[PDB]
């Protein structure tokens, strides 16, 4: 698993630059915000609905406890 017998590649070229030549925050907000918005758009329609229905269930149960708790006119 050590380096040397991981896999086999051919005709693959990797260009890279020194960390001392690039800026560690290249367009942090110019490109970061659109990417975060795109990721949120991709994920929200799958992650939100279970949590929103959990919130509905929690509120409903919390209100249900009181009226069963409340005084019954009799």
């Amino acid at each position: 698993r050590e380096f040397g017998h991981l896999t086999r590649m051919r005709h693959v070229i990797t260009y890279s630059l020194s960390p001392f030549e690039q800026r560690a925050f290249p367009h942090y907000f110019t490109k970061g915000i659109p990417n975060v918005l795109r990721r949120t758009r991709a994920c929200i329609l799958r992650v939100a609905p279970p949590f929103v229905v959990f919130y509905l269930v929690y509120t409903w149960g919390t209100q249900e406890f009181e009226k069963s708790k409340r005084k019954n006119p009799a």
Partner: protein, 379 residues
């Protein structure tokens, strides 16, 4: 003639386990939790020892000794609340780690997965015995309830329960043996974590895409050391916020009352990280069935490598499976909340439905949905 880093035996092990270990280039922030738990473990041990040097595991003095720690020991309160909230953080990171493993199809690592399940069980046992030590009202009565749980097992039953109790019920002897078991267990956890890492290293790691990353491995030291250091700094931020701004946020106030066995507190709930099991306990009317469901809730993680049927290791390219997983997570929070609440008409039915859904998603919905996805994707 040769670098010491990869020639000295201990240095060789450290090198090929933390420095030159080939790791996937695109592991997300979730993988960082694997480090945090370990750090939490050390933070649990190193802080915990410093409580053991002023804690007397005696019924007549345990609570008084803890109050002495928090009021008279120099910076003792920091150690005590750091320990408690660090245990809470440990469980948070543990749950997030299990979620990461389940999501990105990591349970194909089998041996590592089973070792992780064993570690999880040991950690829950450790926290259970730990909560008893302050000998508060909630500590005492939660210990009473959880130990009385074991009376449901057939035949042996009460004999096993009294064997654990060291008597007719929880008392001085029970406190002392809980303290000793609590001291020993985390070192077993450390050895098991070493075995977990050993098993994991033979195959590498699961990247978020789920495909083999042998074509993009990078050395661990330059990148992931600093990445996990940033993660540990974030975890320290959260933990220190909890300790220094709301120390008892995740903690019942009644534990600040000396344990009086003649008064049942109005509410008897375990620590926040046990409620999901306890709620399942409340769901099953039968006591034996309740205990079996409680243990099966955690044991079901072993069945996961057998219940995976989709031809894709990860869940990154599987939308309906993603929706099912997030429904499972929401069900887990629902179970936690239900366990927090008492047992009345609004909550009993919700607990039953939540438990049924929690088992159904893992055992039924997820595999059938994986079949549906495989069929939908022409394979």
């Amino acid at each position: 003639m040769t670098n010491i880093r990869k020639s000295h035996p201990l240095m060789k092990i450290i090198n090929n386990a933390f420095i030159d270990l080939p790791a996937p280039s695109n592991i997300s922030s979730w993988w960082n939790f694997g480090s945090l738990l370990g750090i939490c473990l050390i933070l649990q041990i190193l802080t915990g020892l410093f409580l053991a040097m002023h804690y007397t595991s005696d019924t007549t003095t345990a609570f008084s000794s803890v109050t002495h720690i928090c009021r008279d020991v120099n910076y003792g309160w920091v150690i005590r609340y750091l320990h408690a909230n660090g245990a809470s953080m440990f469980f948070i990171c543990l749950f997030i780690h299990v979620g990461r493993g389940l999501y990105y199809g990591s349970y194909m690592f089998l041996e590592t997965w089973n070792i992780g399940v064993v570690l999880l069980f040991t950690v829950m046992a450790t926290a259970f015995m730990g909560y008893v030590l302050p000998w508060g009202q909630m500590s005492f009565w939660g210990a009473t309830v959880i130990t009385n749980l074991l009376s449901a097992i057939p035949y042996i039953g009460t004999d096993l329960v009294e064997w654990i109790w060291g008597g007719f019920s929880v008392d001085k002897a029970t406190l002392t043996r809980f303290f000793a078991f609590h001291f020993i267990l985390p070192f077993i956890i450390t050895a098991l974590a070493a075995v977990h890492l050993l098993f994991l290293h033979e195959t590498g790691s699961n990247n978020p895409t789920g495909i083999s990353s042998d074509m993009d491995k990078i050395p661990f030291h330059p990148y992931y050391t600093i990445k996990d250091i940033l993660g540990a700094l974030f975890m320290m931020l959260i933990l220190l916020i909890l300790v220094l701004f709301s120390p008892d946020l995740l903690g019942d106030p009644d534990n600040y009352t000396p344990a009086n066995p003649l008064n049942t507190p109005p509410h008897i709930k375990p620590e926040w990280y046990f409620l999901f099991a306890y709620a399942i306990l409340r769901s099953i009317p039968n006591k034996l069935g309740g205990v079996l469901a409680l243990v099966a809730s955690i044991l079901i993680l072993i069945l996961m490598p057998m219940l995976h049927t989709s031809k894709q290791r990860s869940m990154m390219f599987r939308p309906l499976s993603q929706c099912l997983f997030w429904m499972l997570v929401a069900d887990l929070i629902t179970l936690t909340w239900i366990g927090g609440q008492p047992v009345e008409h609004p909550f009993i039915i919700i607990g039953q439905l939540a438990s049924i859904l929690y088992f159904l998603i893992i055992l039924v919905l997820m595999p059938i949905t994986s079949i549906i996805e495989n069929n939908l994707l022409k394979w």
